[PDB]
Assembly symmetry: D2
Homo-oligomer: 463 residues x 4
Amino acid sequence: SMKRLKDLREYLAVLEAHQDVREIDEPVDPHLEAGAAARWTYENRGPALMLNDLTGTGRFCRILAAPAGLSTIPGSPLARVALSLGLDVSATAHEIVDSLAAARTREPVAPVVVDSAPCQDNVLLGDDANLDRFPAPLLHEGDGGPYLNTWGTIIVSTPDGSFTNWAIARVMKIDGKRMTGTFIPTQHLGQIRKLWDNLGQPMPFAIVQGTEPGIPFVASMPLPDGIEEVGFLGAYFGEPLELVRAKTVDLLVPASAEIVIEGHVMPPEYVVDAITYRDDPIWPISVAGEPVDETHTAWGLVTAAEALALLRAAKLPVATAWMPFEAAAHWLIVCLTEDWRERMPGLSRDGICLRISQVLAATRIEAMMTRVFVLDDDVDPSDQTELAWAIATRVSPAHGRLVRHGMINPLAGCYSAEERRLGYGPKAVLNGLLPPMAERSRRSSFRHTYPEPVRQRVIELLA
Amino acid sequence: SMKRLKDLREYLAVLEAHQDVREIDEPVDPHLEAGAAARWTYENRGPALMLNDLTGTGRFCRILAAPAGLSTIPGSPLARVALSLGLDVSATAHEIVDSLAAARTREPVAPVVVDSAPCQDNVLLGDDANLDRFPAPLLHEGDGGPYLNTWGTIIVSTPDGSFTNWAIARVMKIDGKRMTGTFIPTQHLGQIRKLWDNLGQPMPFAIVQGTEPGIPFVASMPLPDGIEEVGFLGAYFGEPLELVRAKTVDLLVPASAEIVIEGHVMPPEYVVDAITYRDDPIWPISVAGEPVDETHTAWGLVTAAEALALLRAAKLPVATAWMPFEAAAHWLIVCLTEDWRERMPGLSRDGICLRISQVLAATRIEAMMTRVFVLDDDVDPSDQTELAWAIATRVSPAHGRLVRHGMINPLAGCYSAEERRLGYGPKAVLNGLLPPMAERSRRSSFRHTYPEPVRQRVIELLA
Amino acid sequence: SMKRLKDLREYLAVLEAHQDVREIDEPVDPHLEAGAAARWTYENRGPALMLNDLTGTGRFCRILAAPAGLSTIPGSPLARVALSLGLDVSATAHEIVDSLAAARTREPVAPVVVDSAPCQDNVLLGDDANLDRFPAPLLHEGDGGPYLNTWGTIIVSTPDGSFTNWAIARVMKIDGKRMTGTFIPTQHLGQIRKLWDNLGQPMPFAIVQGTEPGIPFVASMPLPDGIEEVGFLGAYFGEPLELVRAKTVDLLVPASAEIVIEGHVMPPEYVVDAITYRDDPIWPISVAGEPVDETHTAWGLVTAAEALALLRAAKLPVATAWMPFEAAAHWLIVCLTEDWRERMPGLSRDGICLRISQVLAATRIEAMMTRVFVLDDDVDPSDQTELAWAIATRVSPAHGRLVRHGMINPLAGCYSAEERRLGYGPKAVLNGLLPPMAERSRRSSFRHTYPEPVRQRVIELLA
Amino acid sequence: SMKRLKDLREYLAVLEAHQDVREIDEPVDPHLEAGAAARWTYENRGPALMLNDLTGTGRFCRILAAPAGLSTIPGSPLARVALSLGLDVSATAHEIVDSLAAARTREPVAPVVVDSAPCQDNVLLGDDANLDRFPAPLLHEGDGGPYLNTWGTIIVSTPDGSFTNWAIARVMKIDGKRMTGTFIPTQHLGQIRKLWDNLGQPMPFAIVQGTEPGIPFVASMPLPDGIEEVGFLGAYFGEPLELVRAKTVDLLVPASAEIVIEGHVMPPEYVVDAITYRDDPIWPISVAGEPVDETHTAWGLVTAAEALALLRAAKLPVATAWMPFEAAAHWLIVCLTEDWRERMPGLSRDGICLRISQVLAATRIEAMMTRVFVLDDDVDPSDQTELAWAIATRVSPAHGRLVRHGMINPLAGCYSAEERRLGYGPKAVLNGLLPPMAERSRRSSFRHTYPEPVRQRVIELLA
Ligand SMILES: Cc1cc2nc3c(=O)[nH]c(=O)nc-3n(C[C@H](O)[C@H](O)[C@H](O)COP(=O)(O)O)c2cc1C
Ligand SMILES: Cc1cc2nc3c(=O)[nH]c(=O)nc-3n(C[C@H](O)[C@H](O)[C@H](O)COP(=O)(O)O)c2cc1C
Ligand SMILES: Cc1cc2nc3c(=O)[nH]c(=O)nc-3n(C[C@H](O)[C@H](O)[C@H](O)COP(=O)(O)O)c2cc1C
Ligand SMILES: Cc1cc2nc3c(=O)[nH]c(=O)nc-3n(C[C@H](O)[C@H](O)[C@H](O)COP(=O)(O)O)c2cc1C
Ligand SMILES: [Mn+2]
Ligand SMILES: [Mn+2]
Ligand SMILES: [Mn+2]
Ligand SMILES: [Mn+2]
């Protein structure tokens, strides 16, 4: 019973119905103002913004800010994430990660190729395919230049055409025909590029902006080597994604795109050969920084869903997994089922944390996990207060800590300059599991400490 | 320029003007319902409750629930704390702890004795002084009996009459004439009681309920041995507190009280000799449990103010100190001034954390501090999200941790059964200080990453 | 200027000249007595033993116990190791590991094939090739059966015949024609065996006993994948090793052997097809246990030499490396040169320990290192007392510890049952490096604290 | 059945009978040579030295070097300690500490005052009482001046004359009439001196050299406040010590002394008022530095005996305690009895280490213990090799460590400059206890792994 939104226009019409998108008709400068407007929106939990008029390009190309920021919908802060993933506006943190992890146990669904798509209604080729026709937002004061890709998907195939990877990575503008980005060897973009460099040939690419809202979530997901994002998207929604042939390169791109940038990566510079776009195009942006933005609501969230799927595939009794937004995607919380001891009869609390550390260490997400807290499932790790309370009251100030040293996230802040320079530092697994305890010995709150007739009577007097 | 509220009636009239107190006219049972109503209020950030009609005693004695819970006043969650301490309704976490710590550098102000007070308008003596005339609330399902004192102040003097201690401690009802409580040797009540036991004489006492709202905050404050709470209250408000002579014991009690219970502690049982009360008495309660209640807003908060004063008296450059409510008064956050290196030229980051640990370890609050995080003052430790972000991004997963073993808080949850039974366990000091860094290299947010004209322009478009 | 001993007879004639081998003419039972005689010898630093008469087989096959135990030679406890490696009887711990590590920088020297060898003077084929003709020592009370290989070398080749591995592993007797051993996947024997199992063919093998004394040291050495022990032995001694063709299998074996057991490993059982031996054969044994035996003098020592070579190949300024015998080959000591800061200008003490941990973690010896201590080279890590003094006085009781979790040595004792069962546990790197300090501020001894004329004068009065 | 040696002449006659003292008749310079001769002796395990002829004072006053260094007596390295404490020349480490700890459970024995003593055969008063008559040894190149007291005992009484403390502390010569030393407030000399400073009066003192050999051991012992060393010595030997009245001060001094220096400590300088000595006086020295000297054989050893007595007084099942000489008196080893679980039924291994840490932390020796290792009593902590093997194989590389921060030993080397400057740093308790295990699963050696008839048979063949 999924409610898949098929393009960005549908996504925006749903947000508009819930009063969660605002149109700005006054001119906004892509030089710092658009980025500042996005930050204000994330930090104040404002509606997503449609910037209808940008200095330099006017009303030609709109900008969507905070596409998956925290929502204004009352009682539903995850509504943009939930709607993007075809779920109810009020889907909980656990329902979201559980729906993604459930799709990892399903067979991939091959996409379908359509003859035409709105993303090719306007086609710019040759000298007309120039990025100077579109906004070039300078998102933060100290950036090296305009970041053209922050929320769009980069599409590349291996030379044999047997495998296609979709990924979100930052791409900076050099000039009207050229862009650049960093190609990390631990990422699938970098791995695929090394195959094109070995054959001494430019790698064809496509960057798509403003696709259906579910695509950037799966493009940020650290799926295993050899699992295509498009097949996973298909298994997740229970139907094939519709793709259209790119105009100047042998690649298939989402037919739901607002804009398609096509070209080749030279031996690392992206060279633009064609730009295609649908009428009145919308270019979404994501302005990374402190909590809470799409680094947290999309990347950290889909990473938690992948961790949940990997831990369950190792037969661990994991109720849920979550990357708390307030910890800026530095932490993973792993919650065990109440009956984990019945399910894993041979391990102590320390033993199951050792096992979790061993399983996570064998995966491609292990370097991101600066800290993993292992807790009981009477804690909602998406509830900031309950999570902080559980860590303070259940994790020993000294013991129950398992430290591993190895590869680290170079963007994580909790490392010394020497650890960053070596790319070698500590990652911890912290044990916050309790011994077997009665509910009333580990809780003291309205829901957990009073009989149902007493709570009912209080609710009738006060609610 | 203090705005001291002189009794509970004034406090309640101020909360009523800000729509932060609600009257419940339907009957409420002191058997679990009153406690459940208090928990619902804390956990939902509801108005303080005036329970006007209690099963068993009717409308005789009202109950005030959540006297200093988080406020409903828009943008002012600490308003009940701020008003209780004579400050503006919108006083910040830092203004509150700074006002308390500033009073620790001032000379005590002796109280004044008045001939009469509303708290003695009604006097019950002999067989009439029976607690069965007042509500006996069973605050939580598993409690040993009714907790008569949770927010009132216990008053005792040393045998020589040279020193008087005011403290909040829990007192349980045994029957109509007798109550009990635990007398901890590390607390001033217990220390004073041991002096009365050495002379083989019953210790006279008084318990006051519903005094002016500033008294329970100073009665929860862990002031040094030999500093009277009444003298500190006087220095804090800049004027003498008015006291009245108790009717059957040689003690002075706050003239602002709603109820006064007088008696002697026998060799530990409290025996009631007299009960005095003002017309239409109000008996406030505090229902301890998970965050956020007065364990956090009063006890942890005044403990943070005492830590701030002790650290500043040791000439440490401490900007602020705070006990985060979400960590259930298990954690202390110490924020250093931006120029701490200029103020302490001979210490590294590790060195200043060593010094903080050494100073705190010599004080009477050291056993409460399961964790102390040392951070820079660009972090507001009362902001849940910014605090969690600073810890995740600035505290190493492995290093910068100073562990001390010793006396522990027996109520803290993060200890093993063996550590609790021995009263011996770990307490940590964690270093989250940064090396010297430019604002734009340690922050990425609206306020810190954009020029003032860009922010102004965004505020005019969106706010 | 090597002094290579070409067979076991030469090795024994050299030990006899230094009164470091004793002949036992009384009968000794291979059932526990031979093993007990070996343990007494290791633990009392006795001469190596030649057991001339064994219960069951008489004077047919002699047994050599403690072949490389600590020596009785005055002032030369490492003499058996030094002589085995072609060095002077008085070669120091550092000269030994440095000579082995220097050979890792040299090109391999291919062996030479000889037409005949003393190891084939007697040939047993078919039903005559029966292990019941030779001693079957039960080395420890609780062993599963007789350990036939403890100091001999197992020789196997890959199916293509392109690579030959020589290794010491324990082999237990089942009966007269069959033996067994554990084939670990991290070891080259196990890796080569998996290639024979994939082709569905029995793996040919040879076990050689009593070769020239340098071979078991290189057969215990954890050389990288693809480096043949025979080529390394050749580079080490500066000349080709002489090999002879095995009688029933297509393998080349050391011509210096006392006994050659040939056969095939079935899908894990070793099946004996031929036994060849020189007149009056000697079967050496190694009886593993507490310090000090060949587990320590050979395996831990050659592992320290390989660590020294790997650290120097990563351009680290390592003066020496050593596995202290008293720590039962659980610890590695890494000593940095006095001018390491001049050689590595960009790292602090913590930084260089991080780098050492990172380099060691990428090697095949990392799981053996339960602890690595990083020290200055004013400490001789082969001097028990000076080493214990340096650790106690230079390693912080709390900080300077880098913990990594991963694969562990299943035979190491410092792990819990859960860590052993998972094969996952902690390994530490401890920083004992000093800040820049004058000799007289870090030492207080005869050699370091008195002027040369004062020491000379004292030596003339006392020595 | 004690064999108490009543003076230094008897001690030296016993060492001479065991060929453990050597006379040097050639002249030796007290400027560095005597100290260098002492260091050579400790480090080479040489006989104690009698320096019969010193440059500057000739044959007047002899010097005894290495009075309690490791002995040359075959198989009896602790013989100087054992003889000093009235025990058999072959008394083990455990017999020594057990004999000292047993005396802590006995009532003190008051001394007896004798009318005359050999230490007053020669009396120097007034201007004749000049230290320039005796050697002034410069013990190490960088010392501030000559150390006149290194092995003698400082005697002081409280102003009321109710308590007398005997202690070894270093005393440096200023000139012929004046000396100086540091008066630490945690030591009994410093505490007693503060009482004399409060009354504004010079503290009378006496320094005795060359007393009976048991006195410097008890003078180095950190006995509790209010326990006199003389009473303990009396309880230890089972008889009263004989004291003689000092000539110019109201103090009692050992009648067995070689030299007595009397005077007053001025407001810290020692001023000499009288020197008394027996014919042909001997002035013993102790030259502190690296292991092994009297810092280790006396101070660390008697500290281990006091720890054993304190742990047993807290009803802990401690088999033995020892301060390993190789760890330079930085470490304490605590060995529990094999049946400790039967004796302490309610604690886990971690629990008993917590308890040991808690008990030790309440004592006056806690700051000296940089590390405490808790082990089973199948380990002899005085056996260097077995101790290193037990720590390497039984202490986890990561867990089982209890860190406490507090007062530290300013002379300990394992602290940073900031920890030393603050006098605040880490002290650890490490858990090396095993779970219940069969002897053959935790040992592998001659004594533990072979049946008694097999060992007997091997001993008859080899010993
Ligand atoms: C807003 C946003 C921006 C991102 N930017 C980057 C980036 O510049 N580089 C990068 O390596 N990963 C970035 N990621 C994370 C990757 O998309 C993620 O690691 C993904 O799994 C990569 O695809 P792959 O698993 O096929 O290699 C970003 C994610 C989000 C949501
Ligand atoms: C709601 C509330 C209840 C409290 N209950 C107790 C209690 O039962 N026992 C206790 O020792 N401290 C309790 N405290 C903390 C003490 O009031 C606090 O330690 C105070 O400083 C004690 O007074 P003293 O410093 O004069 O010893 C409570 C505090 C609050 C705010
Ligand atoms: C006395 C002795 C016995 C040994 N027994 C074993 C054994 O049974 N199994 C094992 O894996 N390694 C054992 N080793 C260690 C291996 O020989 C060593 O890991 C060697 O490097 C293996 O050869 P490879 O590096 O070619 O895999 C022993 C070493 C010595 C000196
Ligand atoms: C060779 C030697 C020299 C010593 N020198 C000193 C010293 O200079 N200062 C000191 O405080 N303790 C020194 N000690 C240790 C003290 O004697 C020891 O702490 C003793 O218990 C002090 O006496 P008290 O317990 O009565 O205070 C020395 C011990 C020995 C054996
Ligand atoms: Mn991918
Ligand atoms: Mn008080
Ligand atoms: Mn090999
Ligand atoms: Mn004393």
